[PDB]
Each structure stands twice: as C-alpha cells, then as structure tokens.
Design a protein around this nucleic acid. Sequence first.
RNA 1: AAUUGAAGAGUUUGAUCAUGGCUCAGAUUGAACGCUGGCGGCAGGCCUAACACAUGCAAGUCGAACGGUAACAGGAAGAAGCUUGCUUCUUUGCUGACGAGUGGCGGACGGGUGAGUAAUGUCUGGGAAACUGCCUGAUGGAGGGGGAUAACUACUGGAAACGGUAGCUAAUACCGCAUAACGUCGCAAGACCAAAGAGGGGGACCUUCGGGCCUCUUGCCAUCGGAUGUGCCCAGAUGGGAUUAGCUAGUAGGUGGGGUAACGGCUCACCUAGGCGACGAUCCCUAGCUGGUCUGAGAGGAUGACCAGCCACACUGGAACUGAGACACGGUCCAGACUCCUACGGGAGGCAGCAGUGGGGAAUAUUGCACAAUGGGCGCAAGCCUGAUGCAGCCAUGCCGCGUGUAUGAAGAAGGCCUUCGGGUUGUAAAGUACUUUCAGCGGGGAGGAAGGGAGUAAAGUUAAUACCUUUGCUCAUUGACGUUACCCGCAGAAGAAGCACCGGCUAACUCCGUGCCAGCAGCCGCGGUAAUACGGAGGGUGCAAGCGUUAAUCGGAAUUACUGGGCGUAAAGCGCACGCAGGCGGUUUGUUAAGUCAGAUGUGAAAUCCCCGGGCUCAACCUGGGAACUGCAUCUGAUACUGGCAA
Lengths: 85, 82, 205, 80
Amino acid sequence: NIKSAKKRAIQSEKARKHNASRRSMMRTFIKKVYAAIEAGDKAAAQKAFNEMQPIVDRQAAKGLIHKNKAARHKANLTAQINKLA
Amino acid sequence: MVTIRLARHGAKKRPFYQVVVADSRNARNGRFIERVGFFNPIASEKEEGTRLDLDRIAHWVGQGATISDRVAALIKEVNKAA
Amino acid sequence: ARYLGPKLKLSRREGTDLFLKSGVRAIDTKCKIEQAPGQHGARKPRLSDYGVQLREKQKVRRIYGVLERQFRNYYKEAARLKGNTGENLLALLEGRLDNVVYRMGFGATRAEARQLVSHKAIMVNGRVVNIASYQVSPNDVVSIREKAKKQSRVKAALELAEQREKPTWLEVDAGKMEGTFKRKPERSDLSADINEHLIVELYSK
Amino acid sequence: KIRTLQGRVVSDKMEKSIVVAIERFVKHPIYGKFIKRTTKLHVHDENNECGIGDVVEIRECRPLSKTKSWTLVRVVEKAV
RNA sequence: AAUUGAAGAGUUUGAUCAUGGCUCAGAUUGAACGCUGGCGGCAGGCCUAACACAUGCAAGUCGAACGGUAACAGGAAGAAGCUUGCUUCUUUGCUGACGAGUGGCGGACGGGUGAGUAAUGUCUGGGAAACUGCCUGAUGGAGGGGGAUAACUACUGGAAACGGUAGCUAAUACCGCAUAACGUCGCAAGACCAAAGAGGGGGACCUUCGGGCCUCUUGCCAUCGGAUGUGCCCAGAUGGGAUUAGCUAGUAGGUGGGGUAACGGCUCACCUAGGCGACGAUCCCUAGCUGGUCUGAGAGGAUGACCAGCCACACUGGAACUGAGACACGGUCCAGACUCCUACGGGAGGCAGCAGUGGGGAAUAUUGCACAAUGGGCGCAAGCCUGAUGCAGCCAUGCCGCGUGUAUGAAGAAGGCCUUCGGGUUGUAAAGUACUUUCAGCGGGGAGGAAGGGAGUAAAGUUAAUACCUUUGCUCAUUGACGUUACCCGCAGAAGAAGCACCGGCUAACUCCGUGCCAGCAGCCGCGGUAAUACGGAGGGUGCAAGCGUUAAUCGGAAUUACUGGGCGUAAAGCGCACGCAGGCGGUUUGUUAAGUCAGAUGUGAAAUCCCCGGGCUCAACCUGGGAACUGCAUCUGAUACUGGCAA
C-alpha cells in the first residue's frame, strides 16, 4: 500500500534471501558435525567442529543467530565428542 | 529512552503541566515511572507557579534519562533557587 | 432561575412576613396576610408532618431567594462541614453576597440587593463581583463602586436600614458606603423562629 | 532465609517426583469463619526418598516439568 | 482534620394483631421520547450491525551515509538581438538544494474497537532459567582488501498490475582477511569471533598540487554495568449451572537427543502408569479484567461509558519474513466471502485511525482550523511529518453559574372564576410612577497560554590556532490555530428572554362546569351507572424551573436470602427413624511451639477518583498543592491470653 512500506517489503525480501543462504550454510556445517558423530569418528568430527566454529560465532556476530544459540551448538557438540573421545 | 517531560492535565484553555519521567514511547498523559514536579504556566502571580524535585531529576539524568526542551527551560528557570 | 412573581403571595402562604417587600412603608397594611393564599385560602389547612417540614424549607428558600438544586447543594455542604448542620446551613445562606448587601442596608429587599450585586454595582475587597451567591469570607470589605454610588436606591435603602436591628457580625458604616463582614453569624444572632431541624429532617428522608 | 512451606504427601507413585497437599487456614471473606483450605502441588525430589503420608518442607525453584515448580528441602515426620 | 451515621407509607379483614407478597416516596444514567427552550463555563456524545463502505487526510524523515540531477533559483564559460551594456539561448552538480533510487532509522509508538477469552487473561504478592533498538557509565579497538547491485542506458513481455534480458556505477549496503579480550566453548590446554565512515575549520609541511596532515564534533565495533521495556514461572483472588461426575495417552513423571533469548512435554525416541476431580475436574451458558462508577449508614448489591493500567483483535481462516522488538491496523504470502477494473489472459481492495456515507436502531456530532503549546518520529540543527494533541462546529446529554428586572403602587380598576349574590378571589398582581442595565445587541480597548528558535557580539573551555565547535551572559528583529479571545470601558432602552408536571389517599396543593359503567384515568388502593376534590375543560393552588414529565435500567426502602441482620408447634419451613465416613465442633492440668491471633517495622498497594486542610478560575462546576486513605499481601522482629500442633 502506497507508502515507504513498499521499500520495507523489497528490503525484507532481499534480506530474506541473504539470511536464508547464510542460515542454510550454517546448518549444513552443523550437520557435518553431528553427522560425523553418527559414525564413531573422533578426529573427523573434531575437524568438522573446527570447521563450524568460526562460522557459527561469525553468524552470531553478524546478527542472525543471536549468540546464545551459537554457544548452545558448540556446547552440545563438545559434549558429543567427549561422549565419544 | 526515558524522558523527563511535561504531561498536560488542566482544563480547556487552562493547562496545568505535570513533569514526569516516562518511557518515551508511551502516550503523553499515559504511563509514567514517577512524577517529579509540576508546571503551571499561569497559577497567578503569587508564590510558585512551578516546583520541581531536582534530586530525583539529577537521579534520572544520572541513569540516562533525557530531558525535553521545556523541562530544560524550567531547570534553567529555577536554577538552584531562582 | 429566580422567582419573578407576586411576592406577598409567597409571604402569605407561609403565614409570616418573609421581608419580601421591605421598601418604603411599615408593616404590610395591604397584604390580607393570613387570610387567603389563593381562592380557598380562608380554609385552615390541617397540615401534615411532611407539610410542616416542606413548608419550613419553603419558608427559608423564599426568604433568601434560592431555588432547590442550589439549596440542596447548600445542604450537602452544610452536612459535610464539621458541626451543626442546621447552623452550618444558615451560615452558608448568610454568607451569600446578595444577603450581605441586604444586611448592610445597601438594598431595601434581597431582590434589590441581588440586582445591585447582579448589575456590577458591588465590589468585594476591591474586585467587582457580579454573582448573587458569592460566599463572603470573614474579614472582608464589600462596598459599592463609584458608578451606582449616590444613586437614589441605596440612599433610600440605608434610610430604611435604621428601622431594622443592625446585625452584630457586620460593620455597617453608611458614610463611606462600605461594610466589613467580620465573623460568621452565630445561630443565636439571626431570626430565632426558623426551625432548621425540620429541613435537616426533610432532606434526610 | 528462604521462603518454604510444609505439607503432607498425598500420593507417591511417580518417577522421581511427589505431590504435596498444603493446608492454609483462611478466614471466609463474608462469614468470618476460619476455614481449612488445601493447595496440592507437584513437587520434585531427586532419588524419591519420601513415601506416602509423610510431612515435608518444600521450596520454589525453576520449572522442572509441566506444573512442577517446587522441590523439597527436608523430609520430616514419616511415621506410619 | 481526614467515615456527623440509619424515617416510612398504601393494600388481605366487619374490625384486630401477626406473617407475607405487591406497590409508592430517594438517588443515579453514555439515556430515549413528549411539551417547552435565553446565555455562559466545564465535561460527555453509535450502548445496536466486530454490518458494508464512496471521497479526503491519519507515517514519514535524513544528502552531515551514497551514486546522482528530474525540476527551482543562482555561478562559470560560449554564441546572439547587441541598449558595449542589459537581456535571450546553450555546456557544466560548480552551489543552495532536491523528484526518483540505494542506505540508516521510524512504520511493533501514537490512535481504534471489545469480537474472542472463565483463565495461555486480569488483580495482588513472590520468584529465576532470560532478551533488551534508541538513552547512560567504564574499559578498549576502529587495520587492510574484494565482488556486487539498484538508480541509469539499451532492447523487450503485458490492457493494466507488474515484470524480463544485457551492460555501467557508489556507499555507513554486502563479503572475506588481519587483530582478540576481564567475550563464547572448554576442567584446563587451547580453539574461535567485529567494525564505518561523515561533517566544520585550519598554521606549517607534502601534494599524483583532487587532497594528504592537525584539531574538534558526530557516527561504527567488542565486553561489562545501569535504566527502561518485554518474555517466563508460582500462590491466592476474580461469573452462573450438578436437570454437566467423571476427565486425561504428550496425557502425568523420568532418562537422553533436539529446540528457544530463557526454564519447561516446548518437541521427539524410550521407560514408568501416572495426573486432574465433589476444596467441583470435564462439559454448557455468559463475559474483556482492573483503578474505579452508581447506590448504601454500613456490610453489601449492581456495574466497569469518559479518564488511566493490562490483555485481545485489525474483512474471515492460517502462516511465516524482516527486525532490538510483530507472527505486524494503514507490511508480505496463501485460501475464502464480498466489491471493483479488464483487451477475459489476469489484476485490485480492506475506516473496529479522523471526518463522512448507506444500513440497523428509541438513540448519539463536522467530509472544520492549526501544528502556536505538550508529546512523538526523523535529522547535528534548521526544519519536515503528526485526524496524537490543542482548539473550533453541532446537540439542554449532564453538572454548575447567571438572566427574564427593581422599588413603589388600592380606584383593592377592568376582565376571568366562585358566590349563601353581602361579597370573595385572581391581587401589589397589572396599569400608573420612580430607578437599574447582568447577559444578549452595537462600538472601542485588550492580558495570558511564548517557552524556545534565528542573527550578531563578549567571556570561558578545547586546540598549534585569537579558526570551527560547545557553554554562559548581552543586544536585534521575530514565533498564537483558538481569536471580531478571557476580561475592561462606553451606548440605547425594561427594553430580546418561562415553561413543565401535579392537586382523592400515599403526597405539597380545591371549587365550578361537561360527561353519566360512557368517554376515559391509574404506580398501588381503585374512580366513572346525574349534584365526580380521581374522567375532560376552566378558575385557583402546589412542586420544580431552562427545564419539566414519561419510559428503560441499577441500588435503596426490602431485616422480602438476614455476615452485620430473619425464621421452622399452628403462617412457608424439622429428613419417617437411626448408624456412620469425609466435614464442623470439642472437658481439664502442665510444658514446648507460635500456625491462627495480636503489636511494631520494612517493601509494595501506579496516577487520577472518594475524604481532609489549602490555592486558582468574579463564585460554582472545574483545575490543582500537601496529607489521609487504598480496609490488602509478603517479609522480619516480638507477645503467648485464647484457638491449633506436639509431649505428658
């Protein structure tokens, strides 16, 4: 409707696309981690955890994951590897 | 933002402003944290016209509160005594 | 909002002189007082208990020239004030500005005093008060303005002020034509024959 | 100190938890008679030491399940 | 000083006393209707169709973030009529600025409505497992690069709405890289995580002579605090129905995984078989809740329009996206009903914002003026926006104030009505006479709501700088929608200004005439069938008064649900009689506890409202200062007589 709501519509669409991509990459890295924990692999899962840590902290800082969630992930996953190793 | 601001309470064509401390996104005559003085722009030429608790104002500005232009003008009017 | 009719008729239903035509002459002499308040006025009423209470309230209102919502508000204010509600009610009726102008001899009647008050001929404390029911505080000076001073009425009215009893709670002085309401009138200082317990009991039913 | 309550165990049979009846003794607002009045509470206990018919003190904590915001401190008076 | 507070009557009977119902007298209202209507002040105004909506406004702003120039006005340069001295035209964002666009912030506030919701809500009191844009304090960082994409241009699809394709460009847009804590994870060892510039001014130096460089202001990032706001939990309280007694399988709990900002059946797998319920679950009807309002002596009863706090909703049903915050009134998506446009392929809309329409209804307002004030958004500010708000319009809808004159005046005029025809009454009423001008009308004068903001100085601070900026004084023009304002003065003349109900008893106030169980009246008792104080008219009176009556609704009276504060032999009312569980109550003495109870303290019980003492509007209504109050709850400290617990 005829306003500056049109601009918020198009910006929220653009940011929807950007956030969906970054959120999807973050979730795939976390799937790498506890999909490596599905098999009994310690150092493979540690390599995947070191691969996911900067991106989850980074998406926490960029403002789309709200860092406590960031913390939870790494916390949960650390538990999984010292349940395993 | 919390704001020390005026809030219109008198009758029609006869305002009495009460200076309060409100969360700034409330209504004018709505919800406030504490009232801290008043300002009658008439009152008569008698004694006061305005009293205003400077200790609580200094407390809230210490907390981070902002002050509108009228309340700043009233503090600049009642400076310490006059 | 005020009466505007035959006055001595009101004074004749009550059976008592309500001072409604004080004016030039002496005691009525052309009223046929007591005799006939209407066509069947020669009949004795055999009045009820509601009739005596009602008729007492009407006596007081028709003296002071007050209508019912205003009188009723005086009863509420006299009730809430501390003390004796009959005496407080007469103290509220006696502090009326038109009454104080009548007591000082500035008007011949209370309606003439009410027209002096109404036609901006009266100041209290050096400010002109246009209102019949202004409530005169103690230690006030109420006077006539320079306009409507030395008009005939007030002079004649002061002429008939000496025929009456000179109320104790005033400073009547007619030289300068200014007066001082000094204190509230005591119940024993006024009129002695109105029964205010009847109007307390009238409003308390 | 902490605010706590006392009550008795009304039933027992649940997997590391208990339920406690509290007896508050309150005056009727209209009638002016002091009337007993209960408050059943789902109360947590680690390792379920208290059985049925006990008396136990009880404090409030974070939520531990649906209702269940209460946890014991001291089991007293277990006498059967 | 803050509770000075309580009325009855009519009607059962031939009469009585009691019981008992019905009814009246009071106060109130978002009121409507009937008759009447002068002025002002302050308030209030769709209670019904959460029905459908024409039209106009209700949310924008910033160039001191960025590419840029669509206009407007200048500047520079060129050419021309050339009056060689002024105009016309053109290239240049060069400048003040600015359409469109990117970007930041706001559109989650403000404003509306009460549909749903009987307890995921509200009120009161506790709590822990939290997030928090803007605002504030502290500690520090703010280095070095890259790829894009709008706008723009060129085609192109479409009736339109709206797109598509190919190139170009910027940033405080976006992304890496470095850096790394008193940050995240981890027991540690360690691992890992961010950023953005812009503006004002300037001595010297270096200029690829655009600017580097210095300084100030402002912005960015990280962490820890604070304040505010929000999310979550518990206990108690907050309608009616038992002619609704069983309800519940993610249901109740546990373990582990996931999820959220955060605890949690929030979710899933497995294990246990619980959980709720007669202290009323479940079902059904109704309903937004509260501060409060009305009534009441009070306790209560009814209610929750305005004003303020909380919740919920935004055509209907659902969903998420962006964001600090929404599952979003003037956002997105889908579906549905309706309405509209169409080239028939498809599109568009959402007044329960403010005015306004149509409809519904007994009923409820202007398609107004202004941002001057107060507040909000944006902005360094100027300022722009603001149907919030200030005001104005209409309406007796309420409350309050004032007016319609005042004094005199007996020939007790005339006329009306009654009359025992003597007179009485209307009635000092009118007329006459003498005064006054409130308000309305006319003409002048004229506060206050105006504080700020702008432009020059002077001083101080900062600094390399006597710049720039900030602060404080001083000076100069100014800033009012209301508004021919409030108010004051002058003018002319009583001149423009009184109705409505009632008169048998209750209930204040009476006769005549007309009608004759009719016409009709009525709240109850009941009037009217020929001399009606009850009907209809007249005279007279009574009550209220710019109002007055009727109707609807609430409380009172009603001690006719009785807690305060009732009853049960015969008026209604003792189960047909017992036994007895849960429940209620419990002799007497001592000791302990202190739960009830009592006393004090602290925190809270929002503000307004009620009450008290004051203050301002000429008074009043109204506004307002301080107190009291909010009868409560929680915690701590005590007392231990009574009740309870425990022991004897």
